[PDB]
Design a protein around this nucleic acid. Structure first.
Lengths: 234, 602, 137
RNA sequence: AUGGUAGGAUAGUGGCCUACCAUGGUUUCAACGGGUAACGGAGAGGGAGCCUGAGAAACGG
RNA sequence: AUACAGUGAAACUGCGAAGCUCAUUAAAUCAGUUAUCGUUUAUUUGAUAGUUACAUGGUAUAACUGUGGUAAUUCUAGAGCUAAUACAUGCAAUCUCGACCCUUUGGAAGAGAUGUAUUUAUUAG
């Protein structure tokens, strides 16, 4: 199918249901459809910089928008979690993060913060010619990784060169962002990882208020150490 | 051509490399079939002769095509005239490669195995006789250095293959050749049967002085306890029988050692007489060198698990040494025996005490008892002598720990635990716990009451223990928890018994011997090793082992209470919550197990 | 072992006749995981079973179930029975039901009629078989 | 029809198909069959065969 | 614009072509979920291939020119042209062990080593 009804659109864009008959369908890209933010909604229905899709198209042909340091001209380009949107004409850098409500919240960041992003390690394996590499949550293949990097770790990637500057292991006491379930957008420190082999691993997380909640490991993204996040939080 | 014509030079180097390989390939495949006699001079003059001068420098790293040519000529008797050319420059070229210090093992092995082939391939010509002489002299001079460089067991074996080839031919008849060959052998010591057959041949044919074979006599004597196979033991005896005729002093010793070790089965009457021989006036006579091999045989008889009679004589034989230490006029003569006692007996006693077999252990227990009773010159066991109360029976506890009756054994372990503080820290760790801990893991129900009393005594012993040994003792038992499922209940209860003394000592300082002055260092040891390991074991979801793992929590609180208050706040919650999670479990019997454990912690 | 028209062998496992290092034919085996101990009869056995969880080309993943063996008459597969109490809200009461599940059993396991077997999900072995016996009791 | 072994087909697992072998599999815990306010999935003149494409047995040929 | 160079019909290439009307079916439709270590996948995104040439041929024709048949069609034959991201063909480097320990970063004798895709067998993992 090539058409998406506004009501049938998943929940997280915050789009009003009655604006029109159809909503933008995210195109193929780094992120899955159900957790992506196409540039049209980000520019029009969140920032309001544009009033209509045609104005958005003029904006993108002007090459004023950069996603992760690269100019994108597709209106429905699927920006997602830990994506840096740079607007040089106006001097803004934005990082896409879920809010406690579970919507993407437009968070201003510094240029140093813009220069890098964080990627959860989804897979680590040896490529052709015996070259190890890592696949992150955004589909980025990075070769010659540090040996200590494993699955469920988080790697700090420099956008300009796309290389690994530092990494965080998945361990108890680490600071964590929830990217799914009811707890989506919540932040807390790991307590215990409960393992079911052949099944979905479960992680217990305690917030700063001492409240505890359990979530599947797939919705877990390490973002730093307790009290020392590597990214600016909303 | 000069240097500017780089391209032609590189292509020429490729032609040399490929053609030299081409020569290497053709000699391999059709070398024996084809008759080279017309072309031998031409082949040497145009190929071998230009490169002989720098051959040693070039091919140190790994075998080359040109090197492999001379190796092939070395193996084949028909092609020795290649080596003969120009005053054995070809053979001298292989020689100097070995002479180089940077020569690696990959190049050494093929040349040595080639040199062996020349030694084992007699040829009827004058050039051959000279050739073998040059090859032998260079190799023998330089053998000990090569063995050090070698890092492959096969490379060790081929050296022995060359070395035995020397003995069979008869270069050893020269005294200098014999001395150089012996130097290589001690380097090898510093396959085994080939070594022994070599030693037999060299020492059998020709005479040696005491100073020459003294160091050999000690190590080959120490090899008695090491070897166990009959072919390995018997081959050792002909050497000592052989070393006997070489030096008249050793002749008496070898005849004894020959009758101590009898083969296939040992001669029980004659060996019994020898034990009666030494015990009745023989043990004042024999000297320290005589005592060396005799112990290695006695320690072999005591460990033997089939025969009783050899052992009691052996254990009694060990006690004759302790008598023989008493016999000295002063400490000076004893000190040489005491150092020899410390080097040999004490390490093998300690492993003997850890020996699983009870009746083997009982003898080692008896030997340890006698030394403490008679401590004229050996003063390390004074502390345990204090425990003996002059060796009084029912107080000496050496009998009590191994009477026939079980109740007398139990009463020993309690009194031993009570008087732990008087004892010296090293002795508790090296002897007492080894002799008593096996009761804890004993499967027999008769020793169950013994084991429960043991766990208390070792806990008391663990209090009056040195810090380093207590750590190693604790670490081993955590390793037992992961490694041994059967002993897990015994280990966990025992780890708790270890936790209490650490807790009390940390309470007193804010006890274990040589405890560190600063409390941070033990605290960090608990924080990073004892805590995370014990907590994860307790948190493991294994419903078949939950009840056995519950006393872990009692160990957690004991170590935590030893920590600083900020640590105590950091660490009590995780333990007690886990206790609470086990408390949450539906099972009533488990819930009661948590309730009592929570009570004890309270 | 060789009771079929074709020769039974573990694919990609080679025993070199010339070398003849060991009398025993080289045997490949794996641990299925989940803390499920691979039995020694599988390690030192001589059977060939492509669908065995320890020696065959089958992986255990998904639901792990338990049941009671009700039939063991067919070759290398059995039928187990799982019982439960289904809730009926209209009268607010439970009724017993059961389901019969066919499960593959490796020859490394000996199963009778009446014992309790824990089984693991795997790829479709046959028309109705999708499980594999992994622990007997 | 239930399952085993080997093969054929298949992006592929798989009686999906084929050669041999054992008589099995569900069911009174409701199998199987019947009725229904179960609008509360098919073709492009009718059946058969074939062609393209990443995606069709195509409202194309 | 002395190869052409703006625009550009036709033709050859490239991409995409994926509402109606009948019947009716009880968890075989459908909804939720799990797995694909059992799988194909245009496109998007990111990585990824040192192993005659100052440029080969028609082994090529459309469009186009011209000659005709047919009642006649997105019906036709003969002759003559000319192009490609269409069709076939196809071409004096680097890295290691490194003596000399010469100079003690360093040069360096020599020894070496060096695509990918399919299928089969085998070895390590």
């Amino acid at each position: 199918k090539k058409h998406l009804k506004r009501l049938a659109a998943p929940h997280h864009w915050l789009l009003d249901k009655l604006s029109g008959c159809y909503a933008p369908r995210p195109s193929a890209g780094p992120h899955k459809l159900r957790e992506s933010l196409p540039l049209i909604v980000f520019l029009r229905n969140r920032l309001k910089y544009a009033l209509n899709g045609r104005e958005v198209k003029a904006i993108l042909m002007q090459r004023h928008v950069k996603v992760d340091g690269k100019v994108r001209t597709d209106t429905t380009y699927p920006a997602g979690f830990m994506d840096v949107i740079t607007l040089d004409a106006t001097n803004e850098n934005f990082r896409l993060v879920y809010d406690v409500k579970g919507r993407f919240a437009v968070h201003r960041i510094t240029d140093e913060e813009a220069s890098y992003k964080l990627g959860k390690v989804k897979k680590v394996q040896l490529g052709k010619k015996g070259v190890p590499y890592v696949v992150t949550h955004d589909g980025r293949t990075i070769r010659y990784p540090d040996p200590n990097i494993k699955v469920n770790d988080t790697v700090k990637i420099d956008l300009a060169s796309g290389k690994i500057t530092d990494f965080i292991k998945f361990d108890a006491g680490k600071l964590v962002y929830v990217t799914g379930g009811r707890n989506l957008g919540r932040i807390g420190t790991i307590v215990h990882k409960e393992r079911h082999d052949g099944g979905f691993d479960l992680v217990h997380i305690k917030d700063s208020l001492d409240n505890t909640f359990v979530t599947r490991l797939n919705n877990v993204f390490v973002i730093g150490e307790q009290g020392k996040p590597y990214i600016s939080l909303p | 051509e000069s240097t500017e014509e780089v391209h032609l030079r590189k292509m020429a180097s490729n032609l040399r490399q490929q053609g030299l390989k081409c020569l290497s390939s053709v000699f391999e495949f059709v070398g024996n079939t084809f008759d080279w006699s017309t072309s031998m001079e031409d082949i040497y003059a145009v190929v071998v002769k230009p490169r002989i001068s720098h051959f040693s420098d070039e091919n140190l790293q790994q075998p080359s095509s040109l090197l492999r040519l001379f190796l092939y000529w070395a193996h084949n008797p028909s092609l020795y005239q290649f080596l003969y050319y120009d005053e054995f420059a070809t053979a001298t070229a292989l020689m100097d490669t070995i002479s180089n210090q940077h020569v690696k093992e990959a190049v050494i092995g093929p040349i040595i195995e080639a040199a062996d082939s020349i030694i084992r391939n007699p040829v009827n010509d004058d050039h051959y006789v000279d050739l073998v002489t040059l090859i032998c002299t260079s190799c023998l001079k330089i053998l000990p250095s090569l063995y050090v460089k070698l890092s492959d067991s096969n490379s060790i074996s081929t050296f022995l293959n060359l070395l035995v080839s020397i003995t069979e031919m008869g270069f050893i008849q020269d005294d200098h050749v014999r001395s150089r060959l012996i130097s290589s052998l001690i380097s090898i010591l510093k396959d085994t049967q080939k070594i022994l057959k070599i030693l037999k041949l060299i020492v059998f044919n020709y005479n040696c002085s005491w100073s020459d074979i003294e160091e050999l006599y000690t190590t080959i004597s120490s090899l008695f306890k090491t070897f166990d196979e009959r072919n390995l033991r018997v081959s050792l005896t002909e050497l000592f029988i052989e070393l006997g005729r070489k030096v008249p002093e050793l002749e008496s010793i070898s005849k004894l050692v020959a009758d101590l070790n009898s083969y296939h089965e040992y001669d029980f009457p004659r060996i019994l007489s020898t034990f009666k021989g030494l015990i009745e006036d023989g043990y004042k006579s024999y000297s320290e060198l005589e005592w060396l091999p005799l112990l290695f045989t006695f320690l072999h008889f005591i460990n033997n698990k089939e025969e009783l009679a050899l052992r009691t004589n052996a254990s009694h034989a060990i006690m004759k040494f302790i008598d023989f230490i008493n016999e000295k006029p002063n400490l000076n003569e004893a000190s040489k025996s005491i150092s020899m006692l410390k080097d040999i007996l004490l390490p093998n006693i300690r492993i003997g005490l850890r020996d699983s077999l009870e009746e083997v252990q009982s003898e080692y227990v008896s030997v340890l008892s006698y030394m403490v009773k008679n401590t004229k010159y050996f003063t390390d066991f004074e502390d345990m002598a204090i425990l003996l109360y002059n060796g009084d029976e029912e107080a000496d506890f050496f009998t009590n720990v191994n009477h026939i009756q079980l109740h007398r054994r139990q009463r020993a372990i309690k009194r031993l635990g009570e008087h732990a503080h008087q004892l010296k820290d090293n002795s508790i760790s090296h002897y007492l716990i080894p002799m008593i801990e096996h009761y804890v893991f004993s499967d027999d129900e008769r020793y169950r009451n013994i084991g429960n009393e043991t766990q208390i005594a070792i806990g008391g012993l663990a209090q009056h223990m040195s810090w380093n040994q207590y750590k190693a003792l604790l670490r081993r038992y955590i390793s037992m928890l992961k490694t041994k499922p059967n002993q897990m209940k015994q280990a966990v209860q025992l780890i708790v018994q270890l936790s209490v003394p650490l807790r009390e000592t940390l309470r007193i300082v804010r006890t274990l011997s040589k405890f560190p002055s600063n409390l941070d260092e033990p605290s960090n040891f608990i924080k990073q090793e004892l805590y995370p390991t014990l907590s994860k074991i307790l948190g493991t979801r294994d419903d078949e082992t939950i009840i056995e793992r519950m006393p872990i929590a009692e160990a957690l609180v004991n170590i935590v209470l030893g920590l600083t208050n900020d640590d105590i706040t950091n660490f009590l919650p995780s333990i007690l919550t886990n206790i609470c999670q086990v408390l949450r479990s539906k099972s009533e019997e488990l819930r009661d197990a948590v309730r009592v454990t929570l009570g004890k912690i309270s | 072992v060789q009771s079929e028209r074709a020769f039974q062998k573990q694919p990609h496992i080679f025993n070199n006749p010339k070398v003849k290092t060991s009398k025993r034919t080289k045997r490949w085996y794996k641990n299925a995981g989940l803390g499920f101990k691979t039995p020694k009869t599988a390690i030192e056995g001589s059977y060939i079973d492509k669908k065995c969880p320890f020696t065959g080309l089958v992986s255990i993943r998904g639901k792990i179930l338990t049941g009671t063996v009700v039939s063991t008459k067919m070759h290398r597969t059995i039928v187990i029975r799982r019982a439960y109490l289904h809730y009926i809200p209209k009268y607010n009461r439970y009724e017993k039901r059961h389901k019969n599940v066919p499960v593959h059993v490796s020859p490394a396991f000996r199963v009778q009629v009446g014992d309790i077997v824990t089984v693991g999900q795997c790829r479709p072995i046959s028309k109705t078989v999708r499980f594999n016996v992994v622990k007997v009791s």
